[PDB]
From TrEMBL, chains A, B:
Protein's recorded name: Floricaula/leafy-like transcription factor
Entry function: Probable transcription factor.
Keywords per UniProt: Activator, Developmental protein, DNA-binding, Nucleus, Transcription, Transcription regulation
Range covered out of full length: 189 to 346 of 348
Lineage: Eukaryota, Viridiplantae, Streptophyta, Embryophyta, Bryophyta
Annotated ranges, domain Floricaula/leafy DNA-binding C-terminal: 1-158
Coiled-coil intervals, chain numbering: none
Family note: Belongs to the FLO/LFY family.
A GO cellular component annotation in the UniProt record: nucleus
Compartments reported by the entry: Nucleus
Protein species of origin: Physcomitrium patens
Length: 158, 158
DNA sequence: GCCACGGGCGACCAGCGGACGGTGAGCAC
DNA sequence: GTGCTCACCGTCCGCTGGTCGCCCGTGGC
């Protein structure tokens, strides 16, 4: 059965009602990294191809270990949000406070996350891929297509 | 349109007849690296996903860019041979001279290359992936499945 | 109860990495 | 000329990474 929908929460704020907050959301990425660690270890033992990123097998191993609440499309929906939380925790917290105060839904918050990321990519000579690779938490996540496209167009405009 | 078959040659020895030598074979790996670099530079300009290894797109680009003699299954047959040449030239050269002196065909030489590579993987805590990733030339090539499987069975035996 | 809203995640797709053996080139005699 | 050896690479396959929107949970009234 389908998980509760997310809601915009401030750091350390519990979601009220039949909803999950944004700290629960970011923790799902941290749990995935632990399931990637396990898969890598098993593959090293088996003498099979070892993944460097979160693959379909990592999701499949998470589902069979009871963590059925973890799935590929949902993790993909918010990778950029998690990237901002990792790369600039202070902007990520302020953005969450701003969106909560406005009584904004998750979708508007999720779309707003791309914009401070464009700034971070600008400061790193427009290399969004390198920004993910230098970070231990982000290293395992694929750069979302929409973020790379938005970064490229913004570079042309500015 | 089929290319000449390869023959076992010693370093710097030209192949005789309607045949190609082993230095020509190793040069094809070098050409692929240049084609990947092109594909990489183009992607960076377009703001598209950048490959870190030789993908189907690299091979496809080589064909349309005047190097039609390059194709994926051929390059895949000898990745392990190219790996011995990069990781240990001296052993690669002696193996080539030995197989040439015995009047051996390419198939027998090709299968012999796996064994010195197994010793090299053993000397690196059985981590064949690390061996490839630490070398500039090899980094762009996928570890062949047959090699990783052979290292695994050898680890269980020795 | 009821409806409108909005997002979770099932399921689909293009193309990937990977494999194999039938043609047909090649050389010895 | 003839035969017979053997490997190049056409062509296939289990999946991958990436995507979209249907279904239905959810909260307000």
């Amino acid at each position: 059965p389908r998980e509760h929908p997310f809601i915009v929460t401030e750091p350390g704020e519990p979601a009220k009602g039949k909803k999950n907050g944004l700290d629960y959301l970011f923790d799902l990425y941290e749990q995935c990294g632990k399931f990637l660690e396990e898969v890598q270890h098993i593959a090293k033992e088996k003498g099979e191809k070892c993944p460097s990123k979160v693959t379909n097998e990592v999701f499949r191993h998470a589902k069979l270990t009871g963590a059925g609440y973890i799935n590929k499309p949902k993790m993909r929906d918010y990778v950029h949000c998690y990237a901002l939380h990792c790369l600039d925790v202070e902007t990520s917290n302020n953005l969450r406070k701003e969106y909560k105060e406005r009584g904004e839904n998750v979708g508007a918050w999720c779309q707003a996350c791309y914009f401070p990321l464009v700034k971070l990519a600008r400061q790193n000579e427009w290399d969004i891929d390198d920004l993910f690779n230098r970070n231990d938490k982000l290293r395992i996540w694929y750069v979302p297509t929409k973020l790379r496209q938005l970064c490229h167009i913004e570079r042309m405009k500015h």
